[PDB]
Curated annotation (Swiss-Prot), chain B:
Residues of the full protein shown: 67 to 118 of 1274
Subcellular location: Golgi apparatus, Golgi stack
Note, other: Present with 736 molecules/cell in log phase SD medium.
Organism phylogeny: Eukaryota, Fungi, Dikarya, Ascomycota, Saccharomycotina
Functional summary from the UniProt entry: Required for localization and recycling of the CPY sorting receptor (VPS10) to the late-Golgi compartment. Involved in the retention of proteins to the late-Golgi. Plays an integral role in the complex vacuolar protein sorting process.
WD repeats by residue range: 9-47
Originating organism: Saccharomyces cerevisiae (strain ATCC 204508 / S288c) (Baker's yeast)
Protein name (database record): Vacuolar protein sorting-associated protein 8
Protein family membership: Belongs to the VPS8 family.
Superkingdom of this protein's organism: Eukaryota
Curated annotation (Swiss-Prot), chain C:
Full-sequence portion shown in this chain: 3 to 412 of 1029
Gene name per UniProt: PEP5
The organism of origin for this protein: Saccharomyces cerevisiae (strain ATCC 204508 / S288c)
Family stated for the protein in its record: Belongs to the VPS11 family.
Function: Required for vacuolar biogenesis and for trafficking of hydrolase precursors to the vacuole. Mediates transport at the vacuolar membrane where it may be responsible for tethering transport vesicles on the target membranes. It is required for gluconeogenic growth of yeast. Acts as a component of the HOPS complex that acts during the docking stage of vacuole fusion. HOPS is an effector for the vacuolar Rab GTPase YPT7 and is required for vacuolar SNARE complex assembly. It remains bound to SNARE complexes after vacuole fusion.
Quaternary structure annotation from Swiss-Prot or TrEMBL: Component of the homotypic vacuole fusion and vacuole protein sorting (HOPS) complex, which is composed of a core of the 4 class C Vps proteins PEP5/VPS11, PEP3/VPS18, VPS16, VPS33 associated to VAM6/VPS39 and VPS41/VAM2. HOPS associates with phosphoinositides and the PX domain of VAM7. Component of the class C core vacuole/endosome tethering (CORVET) complex, which is composed of a core of the 4 class C Vps proteins PEP5/VPS11, PEP3/VPS18, VPS16, VPS33 associated to VPS3/PEP6 and VPS8. Interacts with PEP3, PEP7 and VAM7.
Protein's recorded name: E3 ubiquitin-protein ligase PEP5
Note: Present with 1200 molecules/cell in log phase SD medium.
Domain of life: Eukaryota
UniProt subcellular location: Vacuole membrane
Length: 448, 47, 410
């Protein structure tokens, strides 16, 4: 019996639970009668006694070895609750105060390791990534609930200033791709701003998206993020925050509408000199209606909550009363500047008049979704009737009428459930499809 | 691994001046075919 | 294509799995999960998404079977390395994809019994994995997704950690990766995303950009590329062109009409094996009675150097995957259909080829065809003799005497 729980032909086995041996030794060199563990201690003529050593001694040897990663992994393995040799390793038996007294020299030596590498021009992308990932994960499992032990965020800020005079070229890169793979969120605002500035004088424009896409909304930092986005005019990122954090979708739509109808003075979300392209409203609605988060592909986080959002957007888009300012209000905005003409579906009319081709493409994409399926409520018949009545009344220069007729013909081409149309109604479409002087669409008209 | 071995060569000198042995709290005893048990302290101190 | 001539110079034999009789269905379960042959007498199969079995096709009797991995480990691909490890890979919808490696001649019976683990960790868990490539010496592995993301893993995989998950290239406009081929083992990579075929360098010093832009005007569809290992070439397919891109980048363009591709594969650095699917042809003159059944795939084997068509036959149902390996000097190919057949394609004897070609009456072509393999002089003299008499019997004598000039000593 080596100890109270450890028990020892050419291996100390713990009696508790399994009887697996500890390790192996070669006593033949020491001239091993065979039978000839006293007080936790032990060739041909001389007397040799073997004794255990300290973990700190092993760490010191690893320092002399020139590599700290071995000692890093050794300490991490020792940090596990299963330490049958804790008493033999001059450590406290219970794991709680064992981890309490440890993991401080872990932090100090991890800090010293980066300085050791940067001293001998260790600019290789390999070693730094491995060491940083190991440190990050190890600090991640150990939930720091006690005194001292600065969080992982503080460690990154400390390590940032170590690289200086062009040495910050790849350290930001090594900090990145951990957000991409995903093992930590809630980074320090200062380092966030530094990384944003570093990639600002560069044309990445894509690593930033993921940098915000994965990172949890628990760390808000909205004001700083909003200011950075406004300075960099990053409208796709701007809309996402309002979609998720501010929990408002009508406000971006109203801002885009104001940007459209010569009313940029009333915009709130977008106020910088740069103006987003008008096509955003022709893709954001597509994403929301079918179910999607702009600009990514994931439909929705909450299942049932999406129904309210889609019903709200569908009611607002195809309204016919020119609803008032979002939320409770006493006055109503207008599509046009002077409010005298009767607004019979003004928003839909404006959207159709702004761009025929993109609007038709968006509608064609929307019909293939399950939103119009019955499963107020808007069906395909309502939209087809709206377009059919919008066909006449000479309100178009015949540049949009032909496209509308083509789209109606294509929509009524397929009908197991779509729509039944009166015979006289088809006469207008048939006449319009081949009575216009517009050119460049001869090939499309034939197949349609 | 962490088993550092410390060796004292004074055993041969003491024998000149190895069947079984047993260590005490501070010293050790050795017995062989000589028939005289040898007591040796850890500080090179000697029936 | 009918522009060139048709030959018959590869021995093709189809066989049916005999275990299909009764309930011992070796090939009836949907097993789109990939397989791979090791030597001309062995075969591996995956089934039920976590069972691996080995079968000796010489007698169609199961030798050993095992099941590993937790649930939802849907096996995607399966292939053998230049050595013998036979890596295995799969994915889960929520759980991050885990890749592990086994060893040949060491069959597992317990649960894990692995040798190494790979921990590909993309953002969340979506966008299932696409074509992958692994180094011959187990040094670097390149993985491509179906959104525009390319990832690389380096270091030692056999014994050390498969770390260094550095991401290279982002591919804006959200285009899926269609082909990732590792070049000569030292340092090169070929990429494609249905446009802008790229010449990536695995040094890792790229600034998130195409290392060497090339033909950034078009691309190709899924699993439509090949790679000759002998001369480090990039045999691929285009709308009406075939390319021979090298390490530095050359262009040996050809001319051919091919507008219905689905899969291509090279064989022996001189013949390329393709599979063709057409499913009829629509036109105004003819009338489509109903949903016509898909005409089964027609297989062509194009040949380099001289322009000729090797074989053209029909298969039973479809093609799942192709193995196409052989340790001997000759090389053989293998196909797996829907129900499962073992079409064997082997090179025929040279004497049979010369006999059929002289039956075809194209003797002058047979001259250099025999010259390619450097036949014995006696065979050359015999060929000259038969050509000379076959010319003489027609009625022309001058060229017959010209052939007889070196037809002597026989």
């Amino acid at each position: 019996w080596i100890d109270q729980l450890l028990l020892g032909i050419s291996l100390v086995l713990h009696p508790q639970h399994d009887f697996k041996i500890l390790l192996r030794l070669d006593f033949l060199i020491h001239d091993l009668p065979p039978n000839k563990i006293s007080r936790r201690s032990f060739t041909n003529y001389s007397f040799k006694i073997g004794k255990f050593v300290s973990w700190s001694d092993i760490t010191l040897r690893h320092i002399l070895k020139g590599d700290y990663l071995g000692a890093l992994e050794f300490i991490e393995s020792l940090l596990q609750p299963y330490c049958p040799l804790a008493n033999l390793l001059k450590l406290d038996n219970n794991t709680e105060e064992r981890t309490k007294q440890l993991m401080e020299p872990f932090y100090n030596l991890s800090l010293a390791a980066l300085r050791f590498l940067i001293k001998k021009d260790n600019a290789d992308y390999n070693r730094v990534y491995q060491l940083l990932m190991v440190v990050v994960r190890v600090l991640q499992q150990s939930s720091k609930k006690l005194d001292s032990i600065p969080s992982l965020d503080v460690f990154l800020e400390q390590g940032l200033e170590f690289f200086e005079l062009k040495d910050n070229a790849v350290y930001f890169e090594v900090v990145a791709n951990i957000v991409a793979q995903g093992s930590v969120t809630s980074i320090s605002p200062v380092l966030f701003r530094s990384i944003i500035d570093y990639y600002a004088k560069e044309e990445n424009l894509k690593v930033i998206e993921d940098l915000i896409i994965m990172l949890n909304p628990t760390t808000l930092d909205v004001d700083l993020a909003v200011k950075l986005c406004q300075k960099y005019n990053l409208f796709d990122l701007l809309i996402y925050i309002w979609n998720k954090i501010f929990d408002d979708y009508q406000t971006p739509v109203v801002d885009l509408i104001y940007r459209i109808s010569n009313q940029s003075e009333k915009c709130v979300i977008f106020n910088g000199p740069q103006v987003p392209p008008e096509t955003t409203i022709f893709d954001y609605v597509t994403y929301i209606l079918t179910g999607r988060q702009y600009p990514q592909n994931l439909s929705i986080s909450p299942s049932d909550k999406c129904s309210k959002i889609q019903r709200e957007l569908s009611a607002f888009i195809f309204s016919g009363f020119s609803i008032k300012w979002p939320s409770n209000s006493n006055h109503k905005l207008y599509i046009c500047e002077n409010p005298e003409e009767e607004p019979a579906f003004p928003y839909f009319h404006l959207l159709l008049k702004s761009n025929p081709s993109r609007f038709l493409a968006m509608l064609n994409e929307v019909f293939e979704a399950s939103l119009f399926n019955d499963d107020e409520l808007v069906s395909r018949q309502y939209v087809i009737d709206l377009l059919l009545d919008a066909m006449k009344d000479t309100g178009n220069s015949d540049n949009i009428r032909v496209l509308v007729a083509i789209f109606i013909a294509t929509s009524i081409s397929k009908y197991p459930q779509f729509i039944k149309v009166s015979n006289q109604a088809l006469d207008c479409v048939v006449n319009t499809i081949c009575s216009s002087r517009v050119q460049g669409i001869y090939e499309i008209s034939q197949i349609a | 691994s962490v088993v550092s071995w410390t060796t004292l060569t004074h055993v041969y000198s003491i024998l000149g001046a190895p069947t079984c042995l047993y260590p005490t709290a501070t010293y050790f005893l050795m017995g062989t075919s000589k028939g005289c048990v040898l007591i040796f302290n850890y500080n090179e101190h000697l029936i | 294509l009918s522009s060139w001539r048709q030959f018959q110079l590869f021995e093709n034999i189809p066989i049916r799995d005999p275990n299909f009789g009764g309930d011992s269905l070796l090939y009836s379960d949907p097993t789109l999960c990939a397989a791979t042959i090791v030597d001309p007498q062995t075969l591996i199969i995956a089934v039920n998404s976590n069972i691996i079995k080995v079968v000796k096709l010489n007698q169609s009797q199961v030798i050993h079977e095992f099941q590993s991995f937790p649930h939802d480990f849907q096996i995607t691909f399966l292939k053998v390395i230049n050595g013998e490890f036979l890596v295995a890979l799969a994915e889960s919808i929520g759980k991050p994809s885990l890749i592990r490696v086994y060893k040949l001649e060491k069959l597992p019976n317990r649960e894990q019994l692995y040798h190494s683990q790979v921990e590909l960790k993309n953002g969340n868990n979506t966008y299932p994995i696409s074509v992958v490539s692994i180094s011959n010496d187990l040094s670097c592995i390149v993985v491509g997704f179906i959104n525009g993301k390319i990832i690389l893993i380096r270091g030692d995989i056999s014994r050390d950690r498969g770390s260094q998950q550095r991401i290279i290239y982002e591919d804006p406009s959200k285009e899926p990766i269609t082909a990732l081929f590792l070049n000569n083992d030292a340092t090169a990579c070929f990429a494609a995303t249905t446009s802008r075929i790229l010449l990536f360098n695995t040094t890792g010093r790229n600034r998130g950009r195409p290392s060497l832009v090339l033909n950034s005007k078009n691309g190709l569809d899924l699993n439509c590329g090949s790679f000759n290992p002998a001369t480090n070439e990039f045999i691929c397919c285009l709308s009406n062109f075939i390319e021979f891109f090298s390490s530095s980048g050359k262009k040996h363009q050809f001319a051919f009409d091919l507008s219905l591709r689905k899969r291509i594969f090279c064989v022996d650095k001189d013949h390329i094996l393709i599979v063709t699917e057409e499913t009829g042809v629509p036109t105004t003159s003819i009338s489509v009675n109903e949903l016509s059944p898909t005409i089964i795939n027609r297989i062509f084997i194009i040949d380099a150097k001289n322009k000729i068509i090797s074989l053209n036959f029909v298969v039973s149902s479809a093609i799942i995957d192709i193995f196409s390996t052989s340790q001997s000097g000759k090389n053989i190919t293998y196909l797996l259909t829907s129900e499962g057949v073992m079409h064997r394609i082997t090179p025929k004897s040279l004497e049979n080829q010369i006999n059929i070609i002289i039956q075809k009456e194209l003797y002058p072509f047979a001259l250099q065809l025999a010259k390619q393999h450097s036949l014995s002089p006696l065979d050359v003299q015999e060929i000259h003799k038969k050509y000379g008499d076959y010319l003489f019997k027609k009625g022309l004598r001058k060229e017959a005497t010209d052939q007889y000039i070196q037809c002597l000593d026989v």
